Amino acid sequence: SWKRCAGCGGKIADRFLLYAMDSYWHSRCLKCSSCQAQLGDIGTSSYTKSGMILCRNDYIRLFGNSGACSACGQSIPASELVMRAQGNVYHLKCFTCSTCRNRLVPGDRFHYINGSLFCEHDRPTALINSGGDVMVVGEPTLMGGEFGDEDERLITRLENTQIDDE
Ligand SMILES: [Zn+2]
Ligand SMILES: [Zn+2]
Ligand SMILES: [Zn+2]
Ligand SMILES: [Zn+2]
Known part of the structure; x- marks a missing residue:
């Protein structure tokens, strides 16, 4: 049975999906808290701090x-x-x-x-x-x-052949 998206709570039926922060995601549901960018397309990782999930640029801007x-x-x-x-x-x-x-x-x-x-x-x-x-x-x-990578969380792109790397 399908994995649930940590962003929206829904089952993920999409052919391509993301794994990040120990959770599965629709790609559209894994977004920067500040700028709304779709993290899995703009880069290879996210940053977690103070309740937020951030792209690299906003992590630098808010915490660098x-x-x-x-x-x-x-x-x-x-x-x-x-x-x-x-x-x-x-x-x-x-x-x-x-x-x-x-x-x-x-x-x-x-x-x-x-x-x-x-x-x-x-x-x-x-x-x-x-x-x-x-x-x-x-x-x-x-x-x-x-700066150190202690708040960095890599994103992995996965393929559901209905799970393989992309
Ligand atoms: Zn979702
Ligand atoms: Zn951002
Ligand atoms: Zn100056
Ligand atoms: Zn001079």
């Missing part, structure tokens, strides 16, 4: 480590790429030379003195007489960084 821009002071979502320097994070558009206002990009040479950024061609000689050191702009990284 957000930060704040050292230049403008405003929060940075976990999902946003940031520039890094001397232990600070910056909005990409905030990562600019304090003298000429050029936006600094990966591979650029730059100087840092007491929070102020300077491009290679605006070396602040007057200030320098630790800022003498030339640094290389790194690639942008995600604000949230790496």
